[PDB]
Design a binder for this molecule. Structure first.
Ligand SMILES: [Fe+3]
Lengths: 566, 688
């Protein structure tokens, strides 16, 4: 499938880009000269919503893909990146930059008739403006307002006569031909302050889940001899957005100062708003950085931007509350360790290679870009704010005959810390999945018709406990005790009976001595439950994933999830 | 008796009196004259049957269309020449050639306006200058913000006592200073230009053609420039690129009912013939004596174009201009909320109720508008009062012929089901099968003798119910009289007195018979099938999945419970009959899926809302059935067909021709050559 709940405008992404438009400046039709009076073939080329590229991978990997696209079009042209401009921001999980080329020695894209007259002529310039993100935030600041600082890039459409009388692009504030034959780009801004052309400011209110921001252009300053000549900031866009999960959607509006003061220079490029056409997200484990994008109403501007951060009084009681859980435990298995799985906070959706794929009842196969094919089977219809299951990634290149390797995952959207009950006792029941390890292997499918996985917690007492049956009773099963739930999640200890039943051949017993259990509550008023059992250190979900407080290793994994009834 | 024309000024009465004498001289259609003090007084007089017609600017067509007046345009002024006629003109801002400012940097200057609430005079310029006005919003009048924006201006008709700044630039030689009359020299299109030519102001918001009619030759017109919305200055000739708005021509309005529409057009047609342009020596119908501007008609107008009866004030002005006038009395906050929300259009009260449940759960993204018939709902989105609705393929032709585009399609079960589909949104549509359903007892019923029986239809102009069956019967007879294909029928949307409605049963009280919405119990897919199930008709034209879903206990309604699928057969195009299950080989034609339509300016936002709402309330949604379901729920076949799994993307078929298909569109327009379709005749006028 694909992303079935969003348009290319409001689609969540770990990276998005737009390519430089190049209008057809030819003066000939496909047969004879241009009947329009000394006009060109394409005098106005707006941007396209269907031309928005969505990226995946690390920050470096996303940039290389854009560099590959340019290098695929031209043989050996030098590619210019924004790595020099991004140095002063020291981003750790985001980028708001550009990749482009000037196509030195490369002629224009041309298509001519048999007689010789050319009816297609596009400048051989090429480039991108993009934002990239790593580690979508699983926990956010608990409350208050947080100041963010950063930069932004943009790319406009191509219009032949902005002022109506064929002026130079330098007079309008851009490098020659930019805005006329190709789109105007932030990386060819000519009338900006070279010290910092496009600074950006943000103010995120985590109390009201709202975002405010300003996209600013530092205007040109005549004298560059004084290092501290005052800047001339000019607000171009005013940003408003509302938070949802670790992402936000909103609008971008051109400032009135641009409209009334710079009516003949800046208003020629920034003249239409992006109403409900702005989206973004927070990146880093604790929402340290943000990145986003927007495209205006008339597709005249595509902008990208990035930002970075500059007890019981309130919800701010530790400054970090877990927002969502998305982790995996990596036929023979793979490296038995946990790792955060990128996600936007949608339990029934899995983020794989930039696109969100929906999760169905069980046994669906999705194909990756490199050639490997992974088949997943997630849990059951009754769980809605938490999902569990497993997936195995296979590369089907070994041609036999008829008929990271196997991972167990946990996904869910947490409950607000000011939404967990503080009074009473509740009962949950669900299912659980488990895998043995490298020696004699034992898999346990999550069923909800063969696994009981009962739970009980007194919210007034915070003493969660439960058992996950396999055959009958809890004799061939685990027992979870010593609850002590903590804020958004909980941590417990795992014990089994005298042994575990796997199948006088060799009764395959399994023993467990007070293993570590961690998990959290998901959704509304603690509708559901979920967690994991693992042993490397005090390093799991639940508490804000800092992975500290130990220290031995093993190879075993079991993930559970349950819903309540009464 | 005769046509009573209304004059809003003392000199307009004199020319109208001249008009009355000349018509009697040539023994033409008579015209009498009634004198009033303002166009609004003329609008009120017409509503009182003390007058019949008046020429009106687009800004007062809107006023005439409001309650309780509700006057509709009947004849539009025609500008240009006979060989190049046009029924629209451009609102422009004319300035001196000395540059130095644009359309945004004009605060503190002096402006000349044709008049308060006029199209190019007031409504268009103030609307585009609103972001710079610092207006507090309604109910506080916007004239206060304007009177504070410009240093001084001449706005004829403005309240001189409350906003004297809006009248300081007029020269009326007494209390005729800020007059909405030709007694003010700066009054009309021509008058406001004089206010600029004299030098009183630095900008005149007038027609694009005032300079050509008031300046002798191409020597003085080069002293004046135009202000484009892109904040550039361009020569006068390029008004098509440097206009503030394209707006319809001024029009003659009359009463909606008993408005003497036939007589008014007959009078204007003959006056144009005799006293039009370059005609009888004295008394040209357009243009009149010293210092007078546009007496009863625009000067240098050439004639009239008749407006179809269906067109009201909202449709005539167009959605862009209609909402712009409305936005002038909505708060800046209200304007943004309207643009960001999806206004669904419901057909009937029952669909309105379901929408009202949806609106409260849409988190402010969906609101509701209601119309009595589907064509009315199309007109609502055409006027901007509505945004979207799901239409049968036949109605998609109408909406597409009116400029609306499909956005998402109602996806049904595929030709290979295999599951509840996760990628339903990206699954291409496959259409549905239209069938003819008969009771298996009637074994003499064949397709070769279907005519003359009793027929049940979903509604007129619908695909499976009307277009596919009647098109097949029309392709072999050539008869346009569809009321004679069958002896009696229930075809909702027809003439209630016709025999095409003789089989409908109305609501539970028996009223609202043949009405084309859920109130009529024989309406739609299931209503037509019920019309067959109760022996009202002999053959029902529905889709094949309807019979399956309303038999064998799949529907627990009394009329459908105890109905067995074995008691029904399908009329194939052989004369042979087959069971309902074999519809794949015994269907009439393939029918394109029902689709959601909207204006092009709303497609992207509509996609955002619908793709999110159906994730919550669609089939297999988070909040369905616990909170609400768009599709089959406690509600059946309202706003969406019950067989809908999801709203799916169109894969590029974003126009009614591309979506409906080349052959199906060609078939519909062949049938439409027989009919009138007041909505289609309205859109044919508008797209011209
Ligand atoms: Fe006008």
């Amino acid at each position: 499938g694909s992303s079935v709940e969003t348009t290319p405008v409001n689609r969540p992404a770990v990276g998005a880009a737009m390519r430089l438009p190049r209008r057809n400046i030819a003066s000939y039709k496909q047969d004879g000269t241009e009947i329009p009076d000394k006009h060109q073939a394409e005098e106005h080329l707006p941007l396209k919503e269907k031309d928005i590229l969505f990226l995946d991978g690390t920050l470096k990997e996303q940039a290389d893909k854009l560099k590959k696209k340019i290098n695929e079009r031209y043989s050996d042209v030098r590619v210019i990146t924004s790595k020099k401009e991004e140095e002063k921001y020291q981003y750790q999980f985001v980028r708001a930059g550009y990749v482009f080329t000037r196509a030195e020695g490369k002629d224009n894209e041309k298509e001519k008739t048999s007689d010789g007259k050319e009816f297609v002529n596009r400048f051989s310039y090429d480039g991108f403006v993009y934002y990239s993100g790593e580690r979508p935030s699983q926990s956010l600041p608990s409350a208050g307002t947080v100041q963010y600082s950063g930069n932004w890039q943009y790319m406009t459409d191509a219009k032949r006569h902005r002022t109506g009388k064929a002026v130079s692009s330098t007079d309008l504030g851009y490098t020659t031909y930019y805005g006329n034959e190709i789109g105007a780009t932030s990386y060819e801004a000519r009338d900006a302050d070279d010290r910092e052309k496009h600074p950006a400011e943000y103010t995120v209110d985590f109390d009201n889940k709202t975002l405010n921001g300003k996209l600013i252009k530092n205007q040109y300053v005549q004298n560059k001899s004084n290092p501290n000549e005052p800047k001339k900031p000019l607000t171009i866009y005013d940003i408003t957005a509302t938070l949802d999960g670790n992402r936000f959607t909103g609008s971008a509006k051109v400032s009135t100062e641009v409209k009334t003061q710079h009516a003949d220079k800046e208003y020629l490029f920034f003249h239409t708003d992006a109403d409900q056409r702005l989206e973004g997200g927070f990146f880093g484990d604790n929402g340290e950085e943000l990145a986003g994008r927007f495209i205006s109403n008339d597709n005249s501007v595509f902008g990208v931007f990035a930002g970075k951060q500059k007890t019981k009084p309130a919800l701010s009681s530790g400054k970090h509350t877990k927002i969502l859980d998305s982790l995996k435990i990596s036929k023979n298995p793979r490296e038995f360790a946990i790792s955060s799985m990128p996600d936007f906070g949608h339990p029934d959706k899995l983020l794989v290679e930039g696109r969100e794929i929906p999760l169905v009842n069980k046994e669906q196969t999705i194909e990756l870009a490199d050639g490997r094919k992974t088949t997943i089977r997630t849990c059951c219809d009754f769980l809605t704010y938490v999902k569990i299951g497993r997936m195995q990634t296979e590369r089907p290149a070994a041609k036999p005959k008829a008929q990271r390797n196997i991972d167990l995952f946990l996904k869910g959207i947490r409950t607000a810390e000011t939404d967990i009950p503080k009074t009473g006792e509740a009962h949950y029941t669900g299912t659980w999945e488990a895998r043995i390890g490298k020696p004699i292997q034992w898999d346990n499918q999550a069923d909800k018709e063969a696994a009981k996985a009962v739970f009980t917690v007194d919210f007034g007492k915070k003493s969660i406990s439960g058992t996950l049956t396999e055959e009958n009773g809890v004799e061939p099963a685990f027992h979870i005790e010593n609850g002590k739930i903590e804020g958004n999640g909980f941590y417990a200890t795992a014990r089994t009976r005298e042994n575990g039943i796997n199948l006088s051949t060799d009764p395959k017993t399994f023993q467990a001595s007070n293993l570590r259990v961690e998990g959290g509550f998901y959704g509304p008023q603690a509708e559901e439950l979920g967690g994991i059992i693992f042993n490397n250190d005090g390093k799991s979900l639940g508490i804000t994933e800092g992975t500290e407080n130990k220290e031995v290793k093993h190879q075993f994994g079991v993930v559970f999830g349950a819903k309540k009834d009464m | 008796r005769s046509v009573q024309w209304c004059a809003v000024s003392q000199p307009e009465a004199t020319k109208c009196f001249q008009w009355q004498r000349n018509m009697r001289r040539v023994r033409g259609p008579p015209v009498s004259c009634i004198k009033r003090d303002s166009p609004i007084q003329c609008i009120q007089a017409i509503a009182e049957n003390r007058a019949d017609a008046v020429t009106l600017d687009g800004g007062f067509i809107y006023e005439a269309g409001l309650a309780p007046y509700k006057l509709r345009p009947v004849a539009a002024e025609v500008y240009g020449t006979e060989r190049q006629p046009r029924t629209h003109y451009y609102a422009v801002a004319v300035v001196k050639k000395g540059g130095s400012f644009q359309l945004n940097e004009l605060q503190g200057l002096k402006s000349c306006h044709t008049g308060l609430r006029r199209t190019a005079g007031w409504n268009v310029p103030i609307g585009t200058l609103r972001p710079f006005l610092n207006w507090t919003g309604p109910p506080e009048p916007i004239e206060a913000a304007v009177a504070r924006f410009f240093s001084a201006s001449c706005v004829p008709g403005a309240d001189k006592g409350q906003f004297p700044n809006l009248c300081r630039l007029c020269a009326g030689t007494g209390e005729n200073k800020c007059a909405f009359s030709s007694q003010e020299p700066y009054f009309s299109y021509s008058g406001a230009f004089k206010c600029l030519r004299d030098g009183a102001g630095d900008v005149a918001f007038i027609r694009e053609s005032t300079v050509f009619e008031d300046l002798s030759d191409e020597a003085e017109r080069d002293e004046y420039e135009l202000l484009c919305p892109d904040n550039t200055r361009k020569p006068v000739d390029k008004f098509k690129d440097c206009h503030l708005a394209r707006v319809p021509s001024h029009a003659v309005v009359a009463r909606s009912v008993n408005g003497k529409e036939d007589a008014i057009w007959n009078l204007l047609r003959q006056a144009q013939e005799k006293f039009g342009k370059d005609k009888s020596p004295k008394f040209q119908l357009f243009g009149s004596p010293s210092g007078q501007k546009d007496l009863l008609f625009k000067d240098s107008a050439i004639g009239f174009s008749r407006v179809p009866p269906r067109i009201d004030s909202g449709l005539y002005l167009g959605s862009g201009y209609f909402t712009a006038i409305q936005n002038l009395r909505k708060s800046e906050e209200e304007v943004a909320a309207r643009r960001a929300r999806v206004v669904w259009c419901a057909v009937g009260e029952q669909e309105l109720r379901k929408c009202n449940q949806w609106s409260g759960l849409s988190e402010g993204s969906v609101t509701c508008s209601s119309a009595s018939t589907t064509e009315d709902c199309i007109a609502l989105v055409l006027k901007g009062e509505a945004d979207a609705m799901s239409l049968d393929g036949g109605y998609v032709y109408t909406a597409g012929k009116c400029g609306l585009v499909p956005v998402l399609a109602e996806n049904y079960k595929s030709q290979q089901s295999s599951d509840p589909d996760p990628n339903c949104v990206d699954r291409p549509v496959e259409g549905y099968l239209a069938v003819a359903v008969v009771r298996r007892s009637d074994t003499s019923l064949t397709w070769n003798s279907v005519k003359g029986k009793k027929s049940c239809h979903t509604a007129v102009d619908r695909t499976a119910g009307w277009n596919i069956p009647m098109g097949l019967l029309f392709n072999q007879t050539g008869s346009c009289k569809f009321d004679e294909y069958f002896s009696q029928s229930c075809a909702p949307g027809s003439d209630p007195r016709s025999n095409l409605c003789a089989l409908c049963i109305g609501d539970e009280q028996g009223e609202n018979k043949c009405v084309p919405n859920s109130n009529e119990r024989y309406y739609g897919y299931t209503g037509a099938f019920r019309c067959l199930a109760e022996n009202a008709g002999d053959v029902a034209f529905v889709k094949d999945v309807t019979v399956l879903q309303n038999t064998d206990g799949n529907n627990n309604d009394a009329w459908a419970k105890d109905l067995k699928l074995a008691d029904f057969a399908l009329l194939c195009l052989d004369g042979k009959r087959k069971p309902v299950t074999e519809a794949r080989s015994c269907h009439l034609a393939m029918a394109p899926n029902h689709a959601v339509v909207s204006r092009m300016d709303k497609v992207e936002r509509l996609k955002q809302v619908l793709l999110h709402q159906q994730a919550k309330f669609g089939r297999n949604g988070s909040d369905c059935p616990d909170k609400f379901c768009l599709f089959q729920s406690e509600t059946k076949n309202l706003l969406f067909n019950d067989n809908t799994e999801c709203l799916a993307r169109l894969h590029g078929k974003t126009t009614y021709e591309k979506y409906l298909g080349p052959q199906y569109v060609a078939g519909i327009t062949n049938l439409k050559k027989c009919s009138t379709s007041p909505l289609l005749e309205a859109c044919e006028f508008l797209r011209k």
